[model samples]
Target: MAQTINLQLEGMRCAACASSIERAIAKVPGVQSCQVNFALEQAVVSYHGETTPQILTDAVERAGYHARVLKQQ
Candidate 1:
């Protein structure tokens, strides 16, 4: 089954900001897909449930933003 993680974002300024984060998360090995909502300042990811969530955290962090873990969805 796919696992979902919802993240609250910091330091976002535009749609491209979210897109940058989405690209980062999508690059993680087990991620199926990622959507970042610039309007909401959130990233919801669908992953393979096979990788550590910290991988996602790191990716987002590297993209020049920070993530606050929300309850898993």
Candidate 2:
């Protein structure tokens, strides 16, 4: 089954920054969806596998944002 995770992203200054983070994370294999809120500095993602969180964090880092898994539900 797929799992959902919420991450806190830092350094997002605009809507385009949110879009960029979302797009990068969505490109990861097995990721089902991604929603990034610039105002909240958060990204919620759903994906399948143990590596999902790591992949999401890596994607954000590559995009010049700081990321960390805040919780899972």
Candidate 3:
């Protein structure tokens, strides 16, 4: 089944930051989509069963940012 995850973001220094995070998160194999909001410091990701929030956060960290799971559905 498909699921959605909400994340709180940190360490973004510019508006373009969201784009990079979006790219990073979207690369995860099971991720369907990633939308990052710079002003809100948040990210919403849609992914399938094989992906975990930990995987998403790891991708964010690798992109030189921070993320924490806020909610899941």
Runs with alpha carbons beyond 4 Å of true place in candidate 3: 51-53, 69-73
Candidate 3 overall Cα lDDT vs. reference?
Answer: 0.71
User: What is residue 70's positional error in candidate 3, in angstroms?
Assistant: 4.6
Give per-model TM-scores.
0.71, 0.70, 0.70
> In candidate 2, which residue pairs get closer than 3 Å at backbone N, Cα or C atoms, i.e. clash?
none
Can you give the lDDT of residue 58 in candidate 3? 71
Query: Which ten-residue region of model 2 has the weakest summed lDDT?
Result: 47-56
Q: Rate the local accuracy (lDDT) of all candidates.
A: 0.71, 0.71, 0.71
Q: For candidate 3, write residues 1-73 as lDDT tens digits.
A: 3687777887876645568767766666677777777777788887655546577567777667887766667
lDDT of 1 at 44: 82
Per-residue lDDT of model 2, residues 1-73, tens digit only: 3777777888767546568766766666778778877777778878656554566567777667887666667
Model 3 residue 68 CA deviation (Å) reads: 2.6
